[PDB]
Amino acid sequence: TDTEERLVEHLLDPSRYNKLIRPATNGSELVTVQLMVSLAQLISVHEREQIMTTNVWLTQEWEDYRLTWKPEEFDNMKKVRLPSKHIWLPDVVLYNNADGMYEVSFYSNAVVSYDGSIFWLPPAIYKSACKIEVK
Amino acid sequence: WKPEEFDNMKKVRLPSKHIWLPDVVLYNNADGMYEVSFYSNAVVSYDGSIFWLPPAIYKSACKIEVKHFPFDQQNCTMKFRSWTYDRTEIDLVLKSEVASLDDFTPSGEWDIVALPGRRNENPDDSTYVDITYD
Amino acid sequence: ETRAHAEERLLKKLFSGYNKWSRPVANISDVVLVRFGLSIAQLIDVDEKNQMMTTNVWVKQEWHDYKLRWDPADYENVTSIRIPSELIWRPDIVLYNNADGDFAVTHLTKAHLFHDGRVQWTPPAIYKSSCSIDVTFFPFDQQNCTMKFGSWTYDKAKIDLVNMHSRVDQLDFWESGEWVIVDAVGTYNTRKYECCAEIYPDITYAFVIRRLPLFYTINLIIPCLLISCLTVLVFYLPSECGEKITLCISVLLSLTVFLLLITEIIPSTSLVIPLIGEYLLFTMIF
Amino acid sequence: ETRAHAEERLLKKLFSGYNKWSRPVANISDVVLVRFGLSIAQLID
Amino acid sequence: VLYNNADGDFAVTHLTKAHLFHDGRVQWTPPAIYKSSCSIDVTFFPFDQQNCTMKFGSWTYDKAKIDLVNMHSRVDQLDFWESGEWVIVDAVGTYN
Amino acid sequence: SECGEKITLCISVLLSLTVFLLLITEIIPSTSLVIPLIGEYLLFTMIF
Amino acid sequence: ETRAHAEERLLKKLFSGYNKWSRPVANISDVVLVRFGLSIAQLIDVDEKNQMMTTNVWVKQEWHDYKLRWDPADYENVTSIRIPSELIWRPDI
Numbered sequence: 001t002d003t004e005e006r007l008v009e010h011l012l013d014p015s016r017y018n019k020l021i022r023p024a025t026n027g028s029e030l031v032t033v034q035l036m037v038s039l040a041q042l043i044s045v046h047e048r049e050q051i052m053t054t055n056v057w058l059t060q061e062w063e064d065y066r067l068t069w070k071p072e073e074f075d076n077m078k079k080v081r082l083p084s085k086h087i088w089l090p091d092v093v094l095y096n097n098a099d100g101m102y103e104v105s106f107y108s109n110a111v112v113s114y115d116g117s118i119f120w121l122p123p124a125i126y127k128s129a130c131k132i133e134v135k
Numbered sequence: 136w137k138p139e140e141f142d143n144m145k146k147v148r149l150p151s152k153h154i155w156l157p158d159v160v161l162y163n164n165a166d167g168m169y170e171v172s173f174y175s176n177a178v179v180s181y182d183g184s185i186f187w188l189p190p191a192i193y194k195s196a197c198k199i200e201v202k203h204f205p206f207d208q209q210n211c212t213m214k215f216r217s218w219t220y221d222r223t224e225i226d227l228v229l230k231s232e233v234a235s236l237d238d239f240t241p242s243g244e245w246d247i248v249a250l251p252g253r254r255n256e257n258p259d260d261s262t263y264v265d266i267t268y269d
Numbered sequence: 270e271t272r273a274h275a276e277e278r279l280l281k282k283l284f285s286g287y288n289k290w291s292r293p294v295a296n297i298s299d300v301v302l303v304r305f306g307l308s309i310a311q312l313i314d315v316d317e318k319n320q321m322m323t324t325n326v327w328v329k330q331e332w333h334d335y336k337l338r339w340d341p342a343d344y345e346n347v348t349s350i351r352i353p354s355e356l357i358w359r360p361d362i363v364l365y366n367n368a369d370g371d372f373a374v375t376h377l378t379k380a381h382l383f384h385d386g387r388v389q390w391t392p393p394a395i396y397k398s399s400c401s402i403d404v405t406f407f408p409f410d411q412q413n414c415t416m417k418f419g420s421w422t423y424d425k426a427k428i429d430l431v432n433m434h435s436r437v438d439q440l441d442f443w444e445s446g447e448w449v450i451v452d453a454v455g456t457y458n459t460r461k462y463e464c465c466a467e468i469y470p471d472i473t474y475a476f477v478i479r480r481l482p483l484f485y486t487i488n489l490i491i492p493c494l495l496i497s498c499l500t501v502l503v504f505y506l507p508s509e510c511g512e513k514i515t516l517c518i519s520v521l522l523s524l525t526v527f528l529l530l531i532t533e534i535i536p537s538t539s540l541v542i543p544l545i546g547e548y549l550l551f552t553m554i555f
Numbered sequence: 556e557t558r559a560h561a562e563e564r565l566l567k568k569l570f571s572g573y574n575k576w577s578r579p580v581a582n583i584s585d586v587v588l589v590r591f592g593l594s595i596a597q598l599i600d
Numbered sequence: 601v602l603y604n605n606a607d608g609d610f611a612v613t614h615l616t617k618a619h620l621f622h623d624g625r626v627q628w629t630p631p632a633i634y635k636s637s638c639s640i641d642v643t644f645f646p647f648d649q650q651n652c653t654m655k656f657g658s659w660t661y662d663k664a665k666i667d668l669v670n671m672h673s674r675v676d677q678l679d680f681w682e683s684g685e686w687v688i689v690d691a692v693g694t695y696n
Numbered sequence: 697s698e699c700g701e702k703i704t705l706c707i708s709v710l711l712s713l714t715v716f717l718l719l720i721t722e723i724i725p726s727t728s729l730v731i732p733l734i735g736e737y738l739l740f741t742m743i744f
Numbered sequence: 745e746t747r748a749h750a751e752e753r754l755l756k757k758l759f760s761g762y763n764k765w766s767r768p769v770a771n772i773s774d775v776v777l778v779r780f781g782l783s784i785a786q787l788i789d790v791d792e793k794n795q796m797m798t799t800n801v802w803v804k805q806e807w808h809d810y811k812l813r814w815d816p817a818d819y820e821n822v823t824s825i826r827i828p829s830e831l832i833w834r835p836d837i
């Protein structure tokens with residue numbers, strides 16, 4: 001729709017939204033990020049290599065006050081889908097990974113509510129190192 | 136540039152990705168990697184001389200001779216060409232007749248015998264030029 | 270008058286104020302109907318040990334975009350053009366059961382755009398999916414590996430999938446000689462996830478493949494049977510010959526080797542045991 | 556005068572309004588004849 | 601693109617510089633490492649003679665928009681590097 | 697028969713042939729449309 | 745007023761005329777001191793046959809940029825920021 005395209009252009013307008021800046025408000029505050037790992041499948045557990053491969057969905061939720069809008073002015077739209085690569089993201093990564101791949105596999109869209117709430121649920125194939133007990 | 140107009144600066148470092156490069160590559164590579172591995176800076180003198188020394192990990196195809204294994208001697212070659220410009224555009228020249236071993240780490244399994252370099256032209260083509268190190 | 274001028278003229282008009290981050294519907298309540306279909310090019314690998322299936326498919330997609338419309342009479346009677354797929358909005362159809370592969374389409378060939386807004390996109394893809402492997406009747410086994418496709422961020426109220434055709438196209442399938450597709454049908458499903466309060470549709474394709482049991486019969490079964498035939502001869506061998514122990518020891522050490530060779534083919538799953546594994550083990554015990 | 560300046564001018568002219576997404580054919584009915592051939596460098600495996 | 605690709609790349613990924621002439625002619629000769637599937641016949645192994653094919657064609661342009669012209673029929677071998685394990689009996693391209 | 701080595705010889709031949717068949721199996725494709733003549737010869741020899 | 749606004753103003757000011765291809769020294773005769781260190785994460789492998797060591801390290805680097813200075817009092821007391829490493833000059837270690 002025209003209204004949705006207008007809203008998307010308005011929100012991500014680089015003249016007013018810089019994705020390199022943390023959405024900190026009220027001063028020197030911190031942004032609370034909620035995590036939730038959803039295990040979709042345990043692909044394999046190599047014992048010789050000591051690597052566990054998993055297919056997980058890494059739920060991530062935070063509040064970005066710079067992506068707020070009034071539903072009345074935008075045809076009562078309550079949430080819109082934005083590309084995750086064009087908004088500020090907390091660079092949450094698998095720190096103990098094996099194979100040296102830290103970020104998610106797909107980079108899906110981020111579902112943004114009108115009140116600034118963000119919801120990002122990217123899938124990922126993760127190869128994590130772990131200590132195998134052979135006794 | 137004129138050094139006197141730039142605080143008597145004689146040479147500066149410019150990124151090699153933002154200046155014209157002769158696309159010299161390892162033509163006979165065996166893994167599909169033609170270019171160098173780093174793309175470092177190029178040291179540019181005030182007279183326009185460019186000095187580029189990028190490192191590279193190369194995988195060249197070799198004709199292994201097995202008749203005298205394990206007392207065999209291999210003759211592996213590395214052929215360098217510019218995969219963009221022909222001889223009518225750029226002329227390749229050898230800075231030295233042999234490869235340099237100034238910073239070489241001895242192998243332990245293989246003993247280096249000779250590393251000559253030769254510049255080859257094709258008398259029938261006139262657009263072909265390469266430098267091969269044996 | 271000319272195409273490379275008219276088509277260029279058309280291309281400029283279409284991508285003047287085009288936004289690729291917005292669902293292409295003239296009305297918010299409308300649904301983007303994506304006709305989804307698969308055309309298998311070949312079955313690259315059916316790895317049983319890793320329980321993964323590698324396939325080469327053409328991910329046929331088709332949807333209507335209301336901004337990419339024009340009147341052919343105005344543009345020298347141009348009815349359709351080829352446009353880059355990275356400049357237009359596309360559905361985010363991902364393979365749910367991806368194992369050691371890419372979730373979405375990563376090649377982005379050109380799309381065919383028709384004057385009424387229809388967009389046909391048929392990118393090729395190599396998908397490495399995970400499928401349960403049942404080797405009870407190996408090498409006469411018949412596997413059933415599935416691929417689940419669906420939109421990742423749009424629910425049924427925004428994007429809905431339509432079965433292009435029930436069966437996976439096989440006109441250009443490449444026969445390998447090891448596997449034969451018995452049937453491959455896509456089934457439309459809808460379900461609710463704990464993530465989100467909306468219904469997310471999906472299309473699951475079930476590839477029922479049958480192995481041709483003449484290689485492993487020639488190379489594993491018959492050699493196994495021949496050794497099993499020597500199991501009983503030790504009892505007809507006279508003791509004075511002094512070769513009884515040599516015969517039965519050799520038989521045991523041969524059957525043991527065959528069991529390990531099979532152990533390296535079948536998956537390490539502990540739900541079912543192959544009939545070949547049972548037979549070898551019982552012969553080893555006897 | 557130098558060849559480099561002439562080439563820069565030519566490149567500026569050619570790509571002023573060039574659209575790479577459009578088929579390069581003078582006319583609607585035209586077909587892009589793409590001459591195709593393969594040169595084999597080595598049969599790796 | 602290569603139709604019968606197997607685990608490799610569908611299209612060229614090196615994208616060298618194209619030679620453009622003043623009459624509009626364009627010559628583009630990039631390199632490629634192709635992994636094409638082919639049926640293996642081992643009836644007479646090790647004295648076998650394989651017949652492996654590579655299928656090339658435009659992915660999105662039909663015959664009414666892009667037509668392929670067979671420059672030469674046989675594959676050019678002037679720069680071929682001898683494998684030492686296989687010998688190319690005959691490599692001919694057929695337009696279909 | 698008095699040498700007491702017939703069983704050793706024949707068993708060794710059988711297992712050597714089986715090992716060579718298994719070695720061949722690691723080279724040829726796992727296809728069921730054609731069978732190598734080397735494989736057929738080895739299998740007939742093992743049966744006999 | 746909000747910290748995000750101050751950070752945006754600071755980012756606009758810093759990269760106004762910044763060049764990432766130039767050594768960040770106020771004087772040519774100066775030398776860029778790059779405090780260098782390693783922090784091994786795991787010794788992935790020690791390949792004896794191929795004679796290679798695979799390690800997972802954090803390449804801790806630290807230098808001084810004279811053109812990336814600001815007064816926190818003028819930017820709502822912003823003391824530090826995180827910027828993509830590809831927007832600034834880096835040592836080519």
Ligand SMILES: *[C@@H]1O[C@H](CO)[C@@H](O)[C@H](O)[C@H]1NC(C)=O
Nearest residue numbers: 270271272581582583584585
């Ligand atoms: C294109 O070709 C057709 C048929 O040859 C002709 O009728 C038409 O006038 C041509 N258009 C231009 C712009 O030359």
Ligand SMILES: *[C@@H]1O[C@H](CO)[C@@H](O)[C@H](O)[C@H]1NC(C)=O
Nearest residue numbers: 001002075295296297298299
């Ligand atoms: C969108 O569709 C709904 C339901 O059909 C309708 O009530 C509404 O008026 C439509 N919007 C516009 C702008 O026509």
Ligand SMILES: *[C@@H]1O[C@H](CO)[C@@H](O)[C@H](O)[C@H]1NC(C)=O
Nearest residue numbers: 341342343345346347348349
């Ligand atoms: C336009 O082209 C279609 C086929 O693409 C043809 O059937 C039709 O007659 C043409 N009309 C005109 C006015 O050229």
Ligand SMILES: *[C@@H]1O[C@H](CO)[C@@H](O)[C@H](O)[C@H]1NC(C)=O
Nearest residue numbers: 412413414415473475476477
């Ligand atoms: C194949 O699997 C699917 C889902 O796992 C099932 O619905 C279908 O009945 C199976 N088909 C056969 C022939 O086993």
Ligand SMILES: *[C@@H]1O[C@H](CO)[C@@H](O)[C@H](O)[C@H]1NC(C)=O
Nearest residue numbers: 649650651652653689690694
């Ligand atoms: C090789 O295969 C192609 C297509 O399968 C066929 O046209 C050709 O005749 C074959 N050549 C030989 C020598 O078998």
Ligand SMILES: *[C@@H]1O[C@H](CO)[C@@H](O)[C@H](O)[C@H]1NC(C)=O
Nearest residue numbers: 142769770771772773774775
């Ligand atoms: C840079 O340092 C040198 C040596 O300390 C000094 O002579 C020169 O004046 C300095 N440059 C400036 C602009 O102060």
Ligand SMILES: *[C@@H]1O[C@H](CO)[C@@H](O)[C@H](O)[C@H]1NC(C)=O
Nearest residue numbers: 028816817820821822823824
């Ligand atoms: C600025 O922040 C620092 C801590 O980051 C704090 O110690 C200091 O008091 C603050 N100053 C003002 C004026 O807010």
Ligand SMILES: CC(=O)OCC[N+](C)(C)C
Nearest residue numbers: 121421422462464465469
């Ligand atoms: C909203 C969103 O990203 O959902 C992802 C998970 N899925 C496909 C089960 C709904």
Ligand SMILES: CC(=O)OCC[N+](C)(C)C
Nearest residue numbers: 381390391392658659660
């Ligand atoms: C239009 C389009 O992309 O078609 C792709 C299918 N193929 C390669 C068989 C023509």
